[PDB]
């Protein structure tokens, strides 16, 4: 029945300085970006603000200053059992992407009925 977006988050995807020592590759490690959310409901907006947090482990302060709205990787939340669907130039959710201007994606209930929603997403550096 609900077509909801009720969650809007960003993780920065990057090679950590570490290699695995059989294949020889970089290896990938993920960190969460800190965040507020503005949902919309009436107007199918869901907004987020993210920040950057602080430096710790292999999110040194080197790599803190790398994280960009151009390549974000950015997840949501939707109403138990709804899917989630890009819609024209729209990127997928959990890949990093362009996150610079806003997005529309179609939210499906679990009884078929379909909301759009507009993502819109800012970085605070
Ligand atoms: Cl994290």
Known sequence: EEAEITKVGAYHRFYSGD???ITGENIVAEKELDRTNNID???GVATAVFT???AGGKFTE???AKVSLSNLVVYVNVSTAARVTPL???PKFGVPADWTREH???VMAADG???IW???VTLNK
């Open 19 to 21: 290699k695995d020592a």
């Open 41 to 43: 409901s009436e107007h």
């Open 52 to 54: 950057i947090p602080a």
């Open 62 to 64: 080197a790599e803190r």
């Open 88 to 90: 024209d130039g729209s």
């Open 104 to 106: 529309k994606y179609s």
């Open 113 to 115: 009925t379909k909301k």
């Open 118 to 120: 507009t993502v819109k």
